[PDB]
Design a binder for this molecule. Structure first.
Ligand SMILES: NC(=O)c1ccc[n+]([C@@H]2O[C@H](COP(=O)([O-])OP(=O)(O)OC[C@H]3O[C@@H](n4cnc5c(N)ncnc54)[C@H](O)[C@@H]3O)[C@@H](O)[C@H]2O)c1
Ligand SMILES: NC(=O)c1ccc[n+]([C@@H]2O[C@H](COP(=O)([O-])OP(=O)(O)OC[C@H]3O[C@@H](n4cnc5c(N)ncnc54)[C@H](O)[C@@H]3O)[C@@H](O)[C@H]2O)c1
Lengths: 330, 330
């Protein structure tokens, strides 16, 4: 039931297409990796010809060439690849009126929950028609804003895909989540946390995940979901201390469902990842004081910010940061 | 009920003490960090004088100075610090006859499950007496062996605390666990896994944890434990689809207990950490084929090995690798 129907048609003049970098292409900077490159490149051409046949002026760019100037030149952004390319596309759109549309250029292998339905990959003119008639819904997805302050801070971001101070609004917003933790996988993180302006709790864990409704289907879900076997063990323990397989798969699914919420809900699902002796809650604001030696904040898996002892971060949710996305019929 | 009573007294001639590097000392390479340094240093002196008053020849070393030659010179190793210093001490002992003893030099802040009971920190002569009389149990803790093969491998280890090929036995054994995953916290890992010589399963997750019975109380427990609130939700869902607080805390505890097993059991608890659409099982052998760009194997949190595409790792459990530890009365 999400979104709202378009008031009129969507008939843009200028569109930037940002295209995924294929596994084959990553080497330039065995048979099947070339195939998946042809499939993708073929679908990007299909997208570009469709735009051009309608009369939309089109710029094709890769990650290295997708900058703020092209976003401002464009009336709309089209991410051609997968959910990651949606994440790339959105990282440089800060205007809540500029639409961002994702097309899964490889349906049979990288099914992407942030892109149009797979039918519109091979039938993309049909999507452009529906846009023209106004037969679609706008969906404004909430995103997370990040402020950084403290001593020895560094607000300059690092693109992971290419290898005393007042509060500072960081240059990206999180569509999926903000991950806060030590740069290195195997080293535990130490920080003080304040949820909704509450008291500071000292915490030692393997990181923090702060996600949106959009992001709740992503890392947060795998951080927090329970397996059908665990539910079965819990019940057997309860049945033994105090059961069909369809009845067990249903409690699991109902439980795992409660981990998911609407991408329109302006709330943060805050998960403490593997705490060491509240692990998860909803919130409007979270503030983290870093107490670690070599930590980072990673936004949507791609933009990293240094986050070392004496840095303070505050994440919250602002209407200005909504991402204008679309919902198509089928 | 673990261990076996000492056949005779333990009266060593030469002991190496490896001492924790305090938070204060890490800077040399605010009031309270100096205090915790005094507490530790005071307890190290207490340990050393106790050894020397008995007549044991003693060498005191820090991490940088704890090498294989000192281990061979010593009849026994004493780790003075916490469970991490136990992990350091054991990383360079490969002889299943050489005892390794841990003393918590800071009981009131870094309680360590691998060290003697806290009483023997301030009453260490009493521990030496019990060793002399033979009033203690030997506990042989199982450890994990790591073999590495494939193309482009690098078997040289890296100490994290200081910043085509045939199978190759790596120079350390895991007392807690082997962690396998991408070097960077926020990047998912891709590998093929083979448990007990079974078929290869392609897997995408946030890493693999392969722990011992000793290690099952450590990272694995926080990877796999369920919170009392989750159990409560599961039951409420089941009660609603199909409950006291002491009855809920008991199912949680019984469930979390099943995640723990004896440090004498020669089995690996294999956990897939946050799998992306078996998550956990016991095994004798696990083989991992790396399919990631910048991955590592981290042993016991401190020794790291490069583990990139085309590397194959096999972990198993060998009697030769048991760590000779002690159990004291109280
Ligand atoms: N589940 C985990 O263990 C884990 C680990 C690291 C990152 N991630 C997620 O990956 C994201 C970045 O992805 P990437 O560009 O590196 O691609 P990727 O292909 O390396 O991994 C992302 C995977 O999650 C899916 N995904 C991404 N956003 C989603 C969303 N909002 N809802 C549902 N599924 C979604 C993608 O389709 C893909 O399957 C991060 O924002 C984070 O949420 C998950
Ligand atoms: N729980 C997590 O999220 C997490 C994250 C990273 C590492 N670790 C564990 O930390 C270990 C290395 O510790 P470190 O030297 O860096 O010290 P540390 O103080 O940085 O963290 C280790 C913590 O776990 C405890 N611990 C360690 N081994 C244990 C065991 N066998 N049983 C029970 N508790 C144990 C320690 O007492 C300490 O509380 C790794 O082997 C790994 O198991 C846990």
């Amino acid at each position: 039931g999400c979104g709202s129907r378009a008031d009129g048609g969507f008939r843009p003049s200028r569109v930037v297409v940002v295209a995924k970098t294929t596994r084959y292409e990553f080497e330039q900077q065995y048979s099947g990796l070339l195939e998946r490159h042809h499939i993708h490149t073929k679908n990007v051409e299909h997208i570009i010809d469709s735009l051009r046949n309608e009369g939309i002026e089109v710029r094709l760019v890769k990650r290295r060439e997708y900058d703020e100037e092209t976003v401002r030149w464009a009336d709309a952004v089209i991410a051609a690849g997968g959910d990651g390319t949606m994440l790339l596309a959105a990282s440089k759109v800060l205007d809540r009126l500029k639409p961002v549309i994702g097309v899964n250029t490889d349906p049979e292998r990288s099914e992407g929950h942030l892109c149009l339905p797979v039918r519109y990959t091979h039938s993309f003119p049909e999507a452009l028609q529906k846009f023209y008639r106004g037969e679609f819904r706008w969906l404004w997805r909430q995103r997370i804003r990040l402020y950084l302050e403290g001593t020895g801070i560094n607000p300059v971001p690092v693109d992971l895909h290419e290898q005393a101070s007042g509060p500072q609004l960081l240059p990206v917003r999180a569509l999926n989540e903000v991950f806060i933790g030590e740069s290195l996988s195997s080293r535990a993180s130490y920080y003080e946390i304040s949820v909704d302006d509450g008291p500071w709790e000292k915490q030692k864990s393997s990181g923090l995940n702060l996600c949106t409704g959009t992001g709740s289907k992503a890392w947060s879900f795998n951080i927090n979901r329970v397996a059908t076997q665990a539910v079965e063990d819990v019940l057997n323990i309860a049945k033994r201390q105090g059961l069909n397989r369809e009845l067990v798969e249903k409690v699991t699914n109902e439980y795992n469902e409660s981990l998911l919420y609407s991408p329109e809900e302006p709330k943060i699902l805050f998960s403490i990842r593997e705490p060491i002796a509240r692990q998860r809650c909803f919130s409007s604001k979270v503030c983290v004081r870093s107490r670690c030696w070599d930590a980072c904040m990673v936004v949507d898996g791609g933009t990293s910010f240094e986050f070392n002892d004496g840095a303070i971060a505050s994440m919250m949710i602002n209407k200005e940061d909504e991402l204008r996305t679309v919902l198509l019929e089928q």
